[PDB]
Design a protein around this ligand. Structure first.
Ligand code: NDP
Ligand code: NDP
Ligand code: FOM
Ligand code: FOM
Ligand code: MN
Ligand code: MN
Lengths: 376, 378
């Protein structure tokens, strides 16, 4: 029975994870929860249902309202990870703020079931140096797919890793069409129900950019051998092409419970985690290229990744600041990626490899401040 | 450098295999060829291109025209296999006549790269009992796909095997429409260029039936956990569904050189064997149910397989006889599968495991006579 800490338990991934665990008592047990404090009703229900009071709440006043909270403050999640015996830490926090808990999870020796891609993108080589082989297991569906498909050959036989992208609500739209996009319109993802950040990032295509960096970091494949194809149904979750011309693909109706279940149970599958494809009804899986002129977020992510060092932290931190500005009505939708480009292209000093967490934090601070100057 | 014997070298698969070997002289060497004698100019070219004089030709007269052929007559292919040192025998013969070469190959201890699915369908447990694990490696694209996708879990984690079928030229047709099918129409496959028999069988859906039996025999998955789905593009070659709900699929533009190369090179992939999927232009992969009312060949294959023993030899033999009658204008297209069903339903005695090859041969003889009896009544 694996002991699981769930960071960001009240969120989209976190709540789906608690459901998988609730359905599988003989294999998993919750031993800790962390949240921000914005959803106390959810947190209350989760405390009662799991019987776990080992909980972190970032916001101090929220922690007082809910009562009986052992860790509060901006370091509460990190402290929780440091002070809880666990076999798996499921990091489902949102944003680069997942960085210290990610580093702490790796130091404990526990498996890190990583949903919080921003922590790996920001940490880069610093997070890789803190992990042992196989210690980080991806929850993100593309990387879960890739890990499964890589069982299909030897390392020297892999040609390309191919990520699928839904294309978002604005698939096929012109650059001009993006001008008057509202937060409401950006909020309507075609295939997944998610928190507001991954929703916005999937609309701007920054999510797929983050995922290209995540792919390079997790699997050690060169950027030039990572492809991205737009697949509107989000049924094929990604695929691997081998040197003989064969492709192996992983597929299922979009439901994050499946990759969540596998990250927890790895390498053993979890019976009944999610519905399989049903071929008793006619259907079709479509594929099309991404228009890189309209959506250059992925090319920008490749540029950031190839530069390496703290540049991937810069890419993500510029996004976090610019996205927030869009959500607040201070900038238009195209300015999100426009600001990322501007910040990235001014960031040559950050191509250096981080020695400690503080180097990544510095790079992020620099990027946010510059993005903020672009906004105003 | 693997020494390969290529049976059925002048055919669709055989010619494609020779090209893969030609393109990869560091990996493979042809050391034997077998053919029927119908394509002599092809065989002349192959002898010259490979430098191999170690050749079997089934038709004696044909063998004379080629000249200098060491093995000739109906057992020529089998004798070639028994007397040629090799690492891999690629059996790309067509029909149940591939049975004795398949058994002889297994006995040599060499890998059997099996394109000739009929020999396994006919031999059933007899062929399985002749083989060691990994010794039979499928050239058939569906089974090559399944083999690859099965690397994606442990055996108890497998829920279903899902085979794709092109649907053939008559996909979507009614039973009434099928009555009017000509041999010429049934010779036009949507996705693969093949010899006449697999082309016909893919149009009648008997090919998918044979492949369902082949799946059960190769992988040990029960018939009721083998699905078939119609996929008109033939890009996804087959898929495995696991107990968590995950499906793993193998895909490529249809090109038999890919599964041929893998079967020869197993478990090592052959660089550059075939083109990969390209996503630079918009495309669609479609799936739809098979119309089992109009096309019961797969259901009848399951029935035969479930019955077991010699019943799968009966299924295939009834098809070979009925198929040839349709080609000769002796019956209409729907009567192919109609005769298969009639023969199967009278075949209760053949649901016993074959002890020897002769048991299989007896069941096949019985089945052909029964099919001919049905044919002569039409
Ligand atoms: N949702 C999805 O399907 C997918 C998500 N991902 C990735 O998984 C991660 C989680 O995303 P998602 O579940 O959508 O996010 P949500 O916004 O739904 O959830 C965020 C979680 O983090 C908590 N949180 C927010 N700020 C803080 C803080 N300062 N300290 C501690 N906890 C905090 C929230 O708690 P509260 O709200 O209670 O304050 C909530 O539990 C993201 O990295 C995302 O990119 C990846 C692929 C798919
Ligand atoms: N073609 C394809 O893409 C696929 C084929 N297969 C299977 O592979 C096998 C071969 O199919 P395919 O290549 O299309 O068939 P073809 O009809 O194209 O080739 C048949 C081959 O067998 C030879 N042959 C015929 N009779 C005899 C005999 N009595 N003794 C020795 N050789 C003989 C023929 O020689 P000749 O013509 O010179 O007399 C020819 O070389 C079949 O079992 C088929 O179902 C499976 C999947 C795909
Ligand atoms: O793994 C699942 N997701 O990343 C949800 C977002 C999918 P998209 O970025 O392709 O729209
Ligand atoms: O493996 C390849 N084939 O069997 C070619 C026939 C394809 P079909 O039976 O699905 O039409
Ligand atoms: Mn993802
Ligand atoms: Mn086939």
């Amino acid at each position: 029975r694996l002991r699981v800490v769930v960071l960001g338990s009240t969120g989209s991934i976190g709540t789906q994870a608690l459901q998988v665990i609730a359905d599988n008592p003989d294999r998993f047990e919750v031993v800790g929860l962390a949240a921000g404090g914005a959803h106390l009703d959810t947190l209350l229900r989760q405390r009662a249902q799991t019987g776990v009071t080992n909980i972190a709440v970032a916001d101090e006043h929220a922690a007082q309202r809910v009562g009986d909270i052992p860790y509060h403050g901006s370091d509460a999640a990190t402290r929780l990870v440091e002070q809880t015996e666990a076999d798996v830490v499921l990091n489902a926090l949102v944003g680069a703020l997942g960085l210290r808990p990610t580093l702490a999870a790796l130091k404990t020796g526990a498996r890190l079931a990583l949903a919080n891609k921003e922590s790996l993108v920001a940490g880069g080589s610093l997070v890789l140096r803190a992990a042992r082989p196989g210690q980080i297991v991806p929850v993100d569906s593309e990387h879960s797919a890739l890990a499964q498909c890589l069982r299909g050959g030897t390392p020297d036989e892999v040609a390309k890793l191919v990520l699928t992208a839904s294309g978002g609500p604005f698939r096929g739209w012109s650059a001009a069409d993006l001008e008057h996009v509202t937060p409401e319109q950006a909020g309507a993802h075609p295939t997944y129900s998610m928190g507001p950040m991954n929703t916005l990032n999937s609309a701007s295509l920054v999510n797929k950019g983050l995922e290209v960096i995540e792919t390079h970091l997790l699997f050690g494949i060169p950027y030039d051998r990572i492809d991205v194809v737009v697949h509107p149904q989000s049924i094929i979750h990604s695929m691997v092409t081998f040197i003989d011309g064969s492709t192996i693909a992983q597929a299922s109706p979009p439901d994050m419970k499946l990759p969540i279940s596998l990250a927890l149970g790895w390498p053993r599958r979890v019976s009944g985690a999610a519905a399989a494809c049903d071929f008793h009804t006619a259907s079709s899986w479509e594929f099309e290229p991404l228009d890189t002129d309209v959506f250059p977020a992925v090319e920008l992510a490749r540029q950031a990744g190839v530069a390496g060092g703290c540049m991937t932290a810069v890419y993500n931190a510029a996004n976090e600041e610019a996205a927030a500005a869009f959500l607040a009505g201070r900038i238009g939708f195209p300015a999100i990626v426009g600001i990322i480009a501007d910040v990235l292209h001014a960031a040559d000093q950050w191509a250096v490899e981080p020695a400690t967490v503080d180097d990544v934090l510095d790079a992020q601070r620099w990027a946010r401040e510059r993005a903020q100057r672009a906004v105003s």
